[PDB]
């Protein structure tokens, strides 16, 4: 067991192993984050102290869920776990959880907002998102919250996916980027959704990289749906059959019918191969959207595609999600996962 030291930073007590030095507050409802230098590995890191991890059954289960998922992710284009620790010496005194990851600088917002992106840059950035998603989806995990602020990028244009969906009603209301990248079937709860909700998000992000503008910046759920249907057309009977809410089907049928637009007249001047790929991602019927593995083999990525270097994940057991436990049982499971952690090479 390492030696810990305590300190108060911005009205919060931080007790961490000596290896972590020069802690500097950088952000704060799921927890507080400090930047630090990890003397063991030489990396600058983010250290997150979880806020009230075991205050309710819901919170204790969410803590366990986040820890299991971060321990599993081992891929160049996905954020991984460098360390996890508690200053507790026993389950009896266990109350605080700290998570350690690589410190991320820019996100994709800083890139698209204030940079000139060639088509070659768009190819490489979207390639890396799809490479990470093929890995994530192979474990039957759905990200659910892909958007530019959840994509870290460095000076060499290398990309990592972070901030897995693990949101409230108010946070999705109005003119907010938190909803602009969501597939319509989950935005309006049309049906039980698949992993291709993430592919819809990738299409929205690719369109924005190519044009410098948000694809579907709706002022509310209904305004955003209208923008979406103007581009991809209104649903045919085949998809309407798959929508569960009779009220939702009723609402859809009240709209005048519209054909799919010509994407070459929307994304003027774009690489024709990029246009072709967007038409395969931005399909209203989620059964018919291209998958991550299929998209990697698309001719738009011929420069980067290497089928011997696009790995899949080890199997991921999520049976706990249907389990009904007490706070102290979720807490004990989390404790076991903290003490069994093995750091990467
Ligand atoms: C590339 C730059 C981003 N979009 C902007 C969006 C906003 O409303 C719509 C949605 C798509 C169907 C047309 C209307 O365009 C235009 C071209
Ligand atoms: Cl990482
Ligand atoms: Cl503790
Ligand atoms: Cl964003
Ligand atoms: Cl990175
Ligand atoms: Cl439903
Ligand atoms: Cl058109
Ligand atoms: Cl597992
Ligand atoms: Mg985020």
First to last CA, the chain: 19
> Is the minimum distance from the CB of 223 to ligand 1 under 6 angstroms?
no
Strand, coil or helix: what is 179?
helix
CATH code, domain with 255: 1.10.510.10
Q: Please tell me which residue in 163, 223, 276, 285 is annotated as part of the active site.
A: 163
Task: Order the strands of the 83-85 sheet from edge to edge.
Answer: 20-27, 31-38, 44-50, 98-102, 83-85
266 lines ligand 1 (CB under 6 A): yes
CA distance 219 to 252: 19
Per-residue b or e along 39-77, where b marks 16 or more CB atoms closer than 10 Å to that residue's CB: eeeeeebbbbbbeebbeeeebbbbbbbbbbbbbbbebeb
Judge contact between 61 and 54, C-beta under 8 A.
no
Angle 46-198-247 from CA coordinates, rounded to 5° = 125
Does residue 163 have an active-site annotation?
A: yes
Could you give the 3-state DSSP secondary structure of residue 264?
Answer: helix
Ligand closest to 208 (CA) is 1
In whole angstroms, what is the distance from residue 252 CA to residue 243 CA? 10
Reduced to 3 states, what is the DSSP secondary structure of residue 187?
helix
Instruction: Name the experiment that determined this structure.
Output: X-ray
The boundaries of the domain holding residue 197 are 106-301
């Amino acid at each position: 067991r390492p030696t810990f030291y305590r300190q108060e930073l911005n009205k919060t007590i931080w007790e961490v192993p000596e290896r972590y030095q020069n802690l500097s507050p950088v952000g704060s409802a799921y927890g507080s984050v400090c930047a630090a230098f990890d003397t063991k590995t030489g990396h600058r890191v983010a250290v997150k102290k979880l806020s009230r991890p075991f205050q309710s059954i819901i919170h204790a289960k969410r803590t366990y869920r986040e820890l299991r998922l971060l321990k599993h992710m081992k891929h160049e284009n996905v954020i991984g776990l460098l360390d996890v620790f508690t200053p507790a010496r026993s389950l009896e005194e266990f109350n605080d959880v700290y998570l350690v990851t690589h410190l991320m600088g820019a996100d994709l917002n800083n890139i698209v907002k204030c940079q000139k992106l060639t088509d070659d840059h768009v190819q490489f950035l979207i390639y890396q998102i799809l490479r990470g998603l093929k890995y994530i989806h192979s474990a039957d995990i759905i990200h659910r919250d892909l958007k530019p602020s959840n994509l870290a990028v460095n000076e060499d244009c290398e990309l990592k996916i972070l901030d897995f969906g693990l949101h409230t009603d108010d946070e999705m209301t109005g003119y907010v980027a938190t909803r602009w990248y969501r597939a319509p079937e989950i935005m309006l709860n049309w049906m039980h959704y698949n992993q291709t909700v993430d592919i819809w998000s990738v299409g929205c992000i690719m369109a924005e990289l190519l044009t410098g503008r948000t694809l579907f910046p709706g002022t509310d759920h209904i305004d955003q749906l209208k923008l979406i249907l103007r581009l991809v057309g209104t649903p045919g009977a085949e998809l309407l059959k798959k929508i569960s809410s009779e009220s939702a089907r009723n609402y859809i049928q009240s709209l005048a019918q519209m054909p799919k637009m010509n994407f070459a007249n929307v994304f003027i001047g774009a690489n024709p191969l990029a246009v072709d790929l967007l038409e395969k991602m931005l399909v209203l019927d989620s059964d018919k959207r291209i998958t991550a593995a299929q998209a990697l083999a698309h001719a738009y990525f011929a420069q980067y595609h290497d089928p011997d270097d696009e790995p899949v994940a080890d199997p991921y057991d999520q049976s706990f999600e249907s389990r009904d436990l007490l706070i102290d049982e979720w807490k004990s499971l989390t404790y076991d996962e903290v003490i069994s952690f093995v750091p990467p090479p």
